[PDB]
Nucleic acid binder design. Structure first.
Length: 94
RNA sequence: UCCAAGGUGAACAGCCUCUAGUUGAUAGAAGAUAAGGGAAGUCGGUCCGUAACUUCGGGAUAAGGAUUGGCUCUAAGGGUCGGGUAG
């Protein structure tokens, strides 16, 4: 990454598992200008639509959750585990 | 010789009911258990607590909460248009 001049490790399975900001004072992407007129307005439009695309991805994630292998059973198991763990989280302290 | 509902049984079975048929058969009155001994007899004694898993399609392309951008060569990857200074 230092060879290529990058200042942030791209999100990869390899980076997360086998190994962020290379430049210690981080730089925000909001003030980073594309310098190309046609794509600058597209970037600003996408920035103004951050919450909408985030919610689209959230709904996609929920629908993927409900379509996984025996999802209702998984939610049931999460319910049981959460109840038991949150009961022990106070029963041990008391 | 023909037709042939459902539920439990969760082992053909048995039990109960739906549709449909019966109330026929003179009427009234008034096997089980057992203390102690133990053959002394006789011919002859499916349901409560775990964990991993686990079904169909569509998807190709390394993943699928995150900052997605993802190899080399190899047919096509919607159409079109547009290039300077001087005489």
């Amino acid at each position: 990454a230092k060879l290529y001049g990058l200042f942030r490790l791209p999100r990869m399975p390899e980076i997360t598992k086998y190994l962020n900001w290379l430049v210690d004072p981080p730089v925000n992407m909001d003030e980073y200008k594309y310098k190309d007129k046609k794509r600058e307005k597209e970037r600003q439009e996408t920035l103004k639509n951050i919450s909408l695309i985030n919610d689209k991805k959230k709904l996609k994630s929920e629908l993927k959750k409900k379509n996984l292998a025996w999802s209702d059973k998984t939610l049931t198991k999460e319910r049981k585990l959460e109840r038991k763990e949150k009961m022990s989280l106070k029963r041990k302290a008391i």
